[PDB]
């Protein structure tokens, strides 16, 4: 583990401030950049000193997410039980857009959900997918530019790589409790080990 992150230098000092703007609060509280109707060229109103491009600062400093991808495995029951997690994402991150990847049966569950933007059908149970369909889904996920991706499917090396190629800042997944999930946590920002080989047993 030292050999992975060389020059670690511990964690951040308690007195670090991370600047002034885009430092505290939530996503809906940011006062800058604001509209400048008096500008003849349509340029916004920016704070003194700060660079013009400020929307990228919240992701680095405050860890804001605007588009989230929840790849929920299972049918109607699991996708229904994932509703409090979706509401939690909406409450914690105001203004976020949540997209769901699930099976054909689980996609119909999100008809009665007020928080999901897109619900997409993808055969997650197939361990050997069609190369064209797999590539199309991966490119779609790459082109949505998800800030964070969560996976309730038990992720091996292949699912970890699929989440890795999503270009998401946070890659969070459930992993296999057995030895076959070795190296999956290297490609994921956060890993969860359930108490059994079946997550729906809970």
């Amino acid at each position: 583990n030292p050999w992975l992150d060389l020059f670690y230098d511990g964690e951040d000092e308690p007195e670090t401030e991370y600047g002034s703007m885009f430092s505290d609060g939530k996503q809906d509280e940011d006062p800058y950049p604001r509209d400048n109707p008096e500008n003849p060229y349509g340029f916004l109103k920016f704070p003194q000193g700060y660079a013009v491009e400020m929307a990228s600062l919240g992701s680095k400093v405050r860890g804001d997410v605007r588009r989230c991808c929840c790849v929920v495995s299972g049918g109607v029951y699991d996708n229904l039980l994932f509703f409090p997690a979706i509401q939690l994402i909406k409450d914690r991150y105001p203004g976020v857009q949540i997209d769901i990847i699930t099976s054909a049966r689980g996609k119909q569950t999100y008809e009665m959900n007020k928080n999901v933007r897109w619900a997409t059908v993808y055969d997650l149970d197939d361990n050997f997918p069609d190369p064209a369909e797999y590539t199309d889904m991966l490119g779609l996920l790459k082109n949505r530019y998800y800030d964070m991706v969560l996976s309730t499917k038990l992720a091996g090396l292949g699912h970890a790589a699929f989440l890795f190629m999503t270009t998401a800042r946070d890659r969070v997944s459930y992993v296999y409790p057995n030895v076959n999930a070795a190296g999956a946590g290297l490609l994921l920002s956060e890993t969860f080990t359930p108490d059994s080989m079946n997550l729906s047993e809970g």
Binding site: P2, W3, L6, F7, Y8, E15
Partner: protein, 176 residues
């Protein structure tokens, strides 16, 4: 125009040992104040080396400018750091330092296998005509003044522009 031979070699060895001690103090001290004070020893030893070779003006310029630099460095290290922290005292060792120690040892070995294999005295006897000084220029600082004023005119004004712009940028960036 030199010291006696054994005295010259003993001074070389002694100042080299002092320089090694100062550099090791620089790269092994947690406190920027302590490592800055070791840097001052390095500066003094290097100025003495310049005096040893033939450079009586470059040594004085090194002393003046680099002493100003280390004084400013100590001031800004006092001002931009936490408490005095005498307890820090030789920061800890990590793997990330151990790999770079090997890399730097390899680099130093590569340099010293060339220095120890090249006959530097052979080059001196080939550049005979480059060592025939003008008899009128007795003062070495006079030669350095003439060759700074005439041979290098464009860098002499470029460094003035560089210093002015560096002063302006230092004032503008560091202002509250």
């Amino acid at each position: 125009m030199d010291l006696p031979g054994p005295i010259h070699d003993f001074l070389l060895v002694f100042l080299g040992s002092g320089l090694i001690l100062g550099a090791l103090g620089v790269v092994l001290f947690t406190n920027p104040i302590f490592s800055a004070f070791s840097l001052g020893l390095v500066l003094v030893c290097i100025s003495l080396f310049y005096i040893l070779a033939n450079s009586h003006f470059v040594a004085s310029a090194q002393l003046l400018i680099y002493v100003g630099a280390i004084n400013v460095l100590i001031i800004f290290s006092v001002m931009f750091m936490s408490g005095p922290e005498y307890d820090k005292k030789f920061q800890l060792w990590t793997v990330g330092d151990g790999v770079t120690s090997l890399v730097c040892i390899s680099l130093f070995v590569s340099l010293i296998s060339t220095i120890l294999n090249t006959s530097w005295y052979g080059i001196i006897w080939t550049t005979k005509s480059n060592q025939i000084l003008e008899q009128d220029l007795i003062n070495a600082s006079q030669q350095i003044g003439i060759h700074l004023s005439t041979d290098f005119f464009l860098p002499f004004e470029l460094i003035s522009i560089i210093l002015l712009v560096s002063l302006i940028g230092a004032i503008a960036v560091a202002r509250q």
